Design a protein around this ligand. Structure first.
Ligand SMILES: CCO[C@H](C(=O)NNCc1cc(OC)c(Br)c(OC)c1)c1ccc(N2CCOCC2)cc1
Ligand SMILES: [Mg+2]
Ligand SMILES: [Zn+2]
Length: 313
C-alpha cells in the first residue's frame, strides 16, 4: 500500500517530458510503467501483485522482433502517460486506467508483418479478422492475459465499469490500425473547424482517444533526432524483412519495403511526416493544446530528414 516506485533523479525529471527515451536497461521498464500508473492513476488503481503478474505476462507475449517489441509497448505507454499528465482534468478515472493498459497491450504478439502481408500470405488471422487483422489479434491477446488466474487487474471494478474499460481498450487498440487514422483525423479536423467538437459526446471522445493512440504509437518521430534516426533503422529492418517475404510470394514489394531501394528512404520519410505524422500531432494540438511539444519535436525531425536529402548529413 505505502510502497511507491522511485526512479533515479534524472529519470524522475525526464519521464515527465514527451521526448523521454526509456533507456537500454530492459529490467527497469516494468518499474517505469508501474511508476507511470501510480502517478497517472494512483497507488490504489491496481493490486501491485496482480499488476506485476500482468506486466510480466504482457512482456512474455511480445516477440524478439526489431521494432514491434516490448520496448515499443512501453515507449507508447510513456507517450500516453505524458498526454494524460499534461491534460489532468480532461479524462475520467476509467480512461486513465484503460489507456495506459491499452498502450502496453496494443501490439501484443506482433510478428513484424503488416495486415497486408498476412492477407497476401493467406495467414489464418486474415480469415478470422478480415479488417484491422493484427489489431483484432492484439485485443484478443489482451483479453486472454486478463483471464489468466491472478492477472485480473480490473477485479475491483463494478460489472459495468469493467465492461466500459474493456470497451475503451478495444476501441483504443483498433484505432492503432493506421488505415483507420486517416478518416478519423479528417473527421476530427472538420469537427474542430466547424466548432461541433464536443468532449461530452461519447462518439467524439472515442475519436479523440483514437487520435491519442495514433500520436502515442508514432511517438518515435517526436524524440530527439539521435533517438528518431536510430529507431528508423529498427522500423525499416521489419519493412525490408516483409519486403523479402513479399518477393518469396512472387510480389514486388512497395519501395518502402525493398532493401534494394534504401536510397529512397529519406524522401519516403518526408512523405510520412507530411501525410501522417505532422497532421496527426497538428490536430492533436488543436484538440489538446498542451501536447504542442509533440508537434514541435515532429517538425524538428522533419527538418533533420530535409538535411539528410540535401546531403548535409
Ligand atoms: C505496411 C506499412 O504500413 C505503415 C503503417 O501502417 N504504419 N507505419 C508506421 C510508421 C511509423 C513510423 O514511426 C513511428 C515511421 Br518513421 C514510418 O516510416 C514510414 C512508418 C505505413 C507506412 C507509410 C504510409 N504512408 C506514408 C506516405 O503517405 C501515405 C501513407 C502508410 C502506412
Ligand atoms: Mg500495431
Ligand atoms: Zn505500435
Amino acid at each position: 500500500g505505502l510502497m511507491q516506485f522511485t526512479l533515479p533523479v534524472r529519470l524522475c525529471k525526464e519521464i515527465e517530458l514527451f521526448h523521454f527515451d526509456i533507456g537500454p536497461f530492459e529490467n527497469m521498464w516494468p518499474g517505469i510503467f508501474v511508476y507511470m500508473v501510480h502517478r497517472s492513476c494512483g497507488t490504489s488503481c491496481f493490486e501491485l501483485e496482480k499488476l506485476c503478474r500482468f506486466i510480466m505476462s504482457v512482456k512474455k507475449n511480445y516477440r524478439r522482433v526489431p521494432y514491434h517489441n516490448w520496448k515499443h509497448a512501453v515507449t507508447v505507454a510513456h507517450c500516453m502517460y505524458a498526454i494524460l499528465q499534461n491534460n489532468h482534468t480532461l479524462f475520467t478515472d476509467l480512461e486513465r486506467k484503460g489507456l495506459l493498459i491499452a498502450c502496453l497491450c496494443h501490439d501484443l504478439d506482433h510478428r513484424g508483418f503488416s495486415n497486408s502481408y498476412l492477407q497476401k500470405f493467406d495467414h489464418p488471422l486474415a480469415a478470422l479478422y478480415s479488417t484491422s487483422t493484427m489489431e483484432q489479434h492484439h485485443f484478443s491477446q489482451t483479453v486472454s492475459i486478463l483471464q489468466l488466474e491472478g492477472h485480473n487487474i480490473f477485479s475491483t471494478l463494478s460489472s459495468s465499469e469493467y465492461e466500459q474499460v474493456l470497451e475503451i481498450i478495444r476501441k483504443a487498440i483498433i484505432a492503432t490500425d493506421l488505415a483507420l487514422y486517416f478518416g478519423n483525423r479528417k473527421q476530427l479536423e472538420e469537427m474542430y473547424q466547424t466548432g461541433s467538437l464536443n468532449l461530452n459526446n461519447q462518439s467524439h471522445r472515442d475519436r479523440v482517444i483514437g487520435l491519442m493512440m495514433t500520436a502515442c504509437d508514432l511517438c518515435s518521430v517526436t524524440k530527439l533526432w539521435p533517438v528518431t534516426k536510430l529507431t528508423a533503422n529498427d522500423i525499416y529492418a521489419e519493412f525490408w524483412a516483409e519486403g523479402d517475404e513479399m518477393k518469396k510470394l512472387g510480389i514486388q514489394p512497395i519501395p518502402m519495403m525493398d532493401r534494394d531501394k534504401k536510397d529512397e528512404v529519406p524522401q519516403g520519410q518526408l512523405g510520412f511526416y507530411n501525410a501522417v505524422a505532422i497532421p496527426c500531432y497538428t490536430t492533436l494540438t488543436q484538440i489538446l493544446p498542451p501536447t504542442e511539444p509533440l508537434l514541435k519535436a515532429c517538425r524538428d525531425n522533419l527538418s533533420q530528414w530535409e538535411k539528410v536529402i540535401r546531403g548535409e548529413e
